[PDB]
Amino acid sequence: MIKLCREVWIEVNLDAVKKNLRAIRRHIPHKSKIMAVVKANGYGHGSIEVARHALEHGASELAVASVEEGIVLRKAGITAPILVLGFTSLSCVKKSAAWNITLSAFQVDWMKEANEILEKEASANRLAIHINVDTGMGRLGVRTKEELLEVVKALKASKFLRWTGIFTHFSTADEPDTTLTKLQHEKFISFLSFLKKQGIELPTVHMCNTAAAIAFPEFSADMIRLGIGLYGLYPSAYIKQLNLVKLEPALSLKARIAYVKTMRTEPRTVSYGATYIAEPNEVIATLPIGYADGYSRALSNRGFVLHRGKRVPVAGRVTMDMIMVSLGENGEGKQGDEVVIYGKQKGAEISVDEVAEMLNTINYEVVSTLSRRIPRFYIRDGEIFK
Amino acid sequence: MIKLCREVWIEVNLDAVKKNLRAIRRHIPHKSKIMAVVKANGYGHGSIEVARHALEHGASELAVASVEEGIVLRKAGITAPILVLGFTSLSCVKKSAAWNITLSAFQVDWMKEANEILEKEASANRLAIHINVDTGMGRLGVRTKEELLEVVKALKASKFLRWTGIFTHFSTADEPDTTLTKLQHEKFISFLSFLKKQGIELPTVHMCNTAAAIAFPEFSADMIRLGIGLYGLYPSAYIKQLNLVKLEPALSLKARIAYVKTMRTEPRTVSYGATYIAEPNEVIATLPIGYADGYSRALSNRGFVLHRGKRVPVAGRVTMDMIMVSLGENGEGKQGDEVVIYGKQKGAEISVDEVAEMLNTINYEVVSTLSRRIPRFYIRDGEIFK
Ligand SMILES: [Cl-]
Numbered sequence A, B: 001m002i003k004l005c006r007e008v009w010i011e012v013n014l015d016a017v018k019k020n021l022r023a024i025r026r027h028i029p030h031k032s033k034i035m036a037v038v039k040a041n042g043y044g045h046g047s048i049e050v051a052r053h054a055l056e057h058g059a060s061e062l063a064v065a066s067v068e069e070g071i072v073l074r075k076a077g078i079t080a081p082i083l084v085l086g087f088t089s090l091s092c093v094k095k096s097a098a099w100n101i102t103l104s105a106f107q108v109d110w111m112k113e114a115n116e117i118l119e120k121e122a123s124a125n126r127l128a129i130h131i132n133v134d135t136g137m138g139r140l141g142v143r144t145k146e147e148l149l150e151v152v153k154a155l156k157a158s159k160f161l162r163w164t165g166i167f168t169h170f171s172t173a174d175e176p177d178t179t180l181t182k183l184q185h186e187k188f189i190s191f192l193s194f195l196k197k198q199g200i201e202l203p204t205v206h207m208c209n210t211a212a213a214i215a216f217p218e219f220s221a222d223m224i225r226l227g228i229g230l231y232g233l234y235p236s237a238y239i240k241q242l243n244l245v246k247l248e249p250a251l252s253l254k255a256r257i258a259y260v261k262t263m264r265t266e267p268r269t270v271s272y273g274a275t276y277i278a279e280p281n282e283v284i285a286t287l288p289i290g291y292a293d294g295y296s297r298a299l300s301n302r303g304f305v306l307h308r309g310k311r312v313p314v315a316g317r318v319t320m321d322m323i324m325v326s327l328g329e330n331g332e333g334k335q336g337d338e339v340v341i342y343g344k345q346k347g348a349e350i351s352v353d354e355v356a357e358m359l360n361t362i363n364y365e366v367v368s369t370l371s372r373r374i375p376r377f378y379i380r381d382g383e384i385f386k
């Protein structure tokens, strides 16, 4: 089946991504479109194949972190609209207009100089722009209704720019306390009511992330931005509890056993620092994955893997390329057996959310730090490719 | 100068690498060679440019973690010997011989099957082999002198394999207690001599790592394997104490400020969870780096960066692609200023050892988990390229 020189890989199940998209479509209003977020190599899953599938099954537009990440998508043949969520330097204004990438802006002087650059070169293309309004996140965006109007005034006087959206971001929509979420919404609405009482037409309006699409579908306005929900992961345990929508996890991580031996001769120390000493009838197995792959060293003498449907412990310290596990006295196993690191095997499961708890972080970090030297295989209609 | 759409990057100083190899060459015996270890994408530094440069200034062989990492070096132009340190699957025996990668091996049965595959194929490609002897690490390799004799005969009968080395690995040579390191050395020296009593002639012997070579230079034998010391960093605080060799770190990490504002309007919340509230006078600057780049989320409300020669702190949680830092009341800063994340600025420093200490890990892991989505630039002789 799968053939590798070093035997470790990732499996990503696209049939699961498709069911996550259907669950979200039925729950939100029909007038509202879906923009799929695939920044940071598709939250670790691989960005090319997941953007392709998503656009075949419900998404209309895409979001990324930087001009460079959008260029990898256009090079694979994707023609849909693509919005950059971070800040972009004026260095890349000409390049973004040529690959037809949409950028966010919120400054009167950036607006002005962006227009000049494309003016002084004639340019048949018009750069599309989305305005970001800061109602409580404190990261980027415009902050008062009077200076938002200067920006609207300026963007309108720019013949080489095109206004195609306006948006904001919720900073606590995954927590039981809904105080601040209700306040940001109130502020955002009054700024567009301000702009509307002057003859200004509004383009596409969007505010919801995964959690706010599930708890407040009445905020869906024109469009939502589906992020961690697309990969089948819940933004918090509280949003998982309201039992409103059913998601399925897309990703598992596997490998094959490299060597087996019984610890009969001395010494019987195991790994750097000699932090674990074996028994003379103990069986010890060696796997090809390490902390340079993204398997945290903090799981030394702590975490597990699944061999033959059993949980088994890491023995000693994690190293850069390999880990060691214990099979017990007279344990059972062969060079070449299959092991599951994140995922499900026979009747067992080690979930991404468990490993995240064990390390005191959130599931976003676990998946999106898995290295690119590990190959990703895709399963669609129960079969393999790439 | 440095022109990017998203403004974050790494710099590798290759004049540092050259000085670090000079120091080592002048510590060990003149009759010993140096094998340079560049696995895991050169410990996060880039494998192609560091190997190219190390082969020109003192090294003669190279080591990697897998066949795939070796082939990237052949495709870049390199004709030096390349040894794979982990376990290689029998289904890559034919590719290794074709690209001329040296494989590690330690089982009688692996040897014969690898010989039969090359017999049914011809091609003047004999596959070269190093034998791994386990003396206390417990990871890979053979563990009794009677077993080692069987494998040396199975190999000397095999007409298409070629025997070019034998090695071992020390698990505690960076610690001040030398007990277990001397035990391992006694075990290895005896096994070698039992082969001599039988009339067997020996190839290249190697056993030392960076700490082993600084601390026990008289264990050098034919060859050493220089890894972490290549990049200007010490194996342990203890080996820095001895004060025997002077190393200079080769890597730093930088970005440019994306936005600056005063928190006059309300509300004054910052980042996810609203874990931080600002004064009506406070200045907040936004930076393009996040945990998907390898900047740990455990640095929320804890870490530092250098801006104009002074440390300023992270404010709020780290997010996937951006962080916020407080410039204080009063303020002082503009869009486009240069910030140092790891390294030096004026007479100030945030070293990689310092950050690994703050996160309860080792410098090995801080460098080699830096994402391939950050671009790398190289300095050689005071000038920049890629
Ligand atoms: Cl934002």
Ligand SMILES: [Cl-]
Binding pocket: B137, B139, B140, B141, B169
């Ligand atoms: Cl080993």
